Amino acid sequence: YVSESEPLVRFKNSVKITKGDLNSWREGTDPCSGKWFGIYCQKGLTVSGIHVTRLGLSGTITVDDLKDLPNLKTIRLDNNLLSGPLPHFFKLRGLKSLMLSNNSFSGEIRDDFFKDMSKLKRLFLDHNKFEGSIPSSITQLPQLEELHMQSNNLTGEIPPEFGSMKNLKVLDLSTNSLDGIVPQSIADKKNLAVNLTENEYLCGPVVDVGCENIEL
């Protein structure tokens, strides 16, 4: 819809693009025409997804304008230069897919970050610089099907509550410094593709590592 051009133009003007432009985002035109870079629309009627990748987006992201798009379900900002703590995507309670792969977001994600995002199906946080523990609210996402957090700086144990996530089919936590013992609930989960490799001090079933310290 033409009305959806107004929040999108504000979003465009809130981000710093260092490799490219969003000149196609022209106020007063319909973002669903086919002429707008990186816009997906439901049935060609209403904005449902924003895919702004490889534009060297720099600084942070705010969601106060994106929240004015009633039917927005997907955000993909992969392969940019964004930094700082995770932006407040939890204000977009209807979001179904969040992809932030290959940026420089940092910090420990607040444990309750994901509490309001009940519709989230896909969460890609890989290849960033997140630190600290996996936020416990991620395991409370009723609809989550895929979690990718590989290539970060995470530490601490893997929450066993991943094993109770009914819809979870892909779990990539590799290349971090997670530790402790792999939860049996994850090892036993049927129809799960899980990758826990390159977590040096993690032991147990899925990583094929005996926990016992051999003192030689």
Partner: peptide, 14 residues
């Protein structure tokens, strides 16, 4: 599978 000299940790595969 795992070897740390500073932590004196040695772990093998299952």
């Amino acid at each position: 599978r795992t070897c740390s000299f500073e932590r004196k940790l040695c772990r093998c595969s299952i």
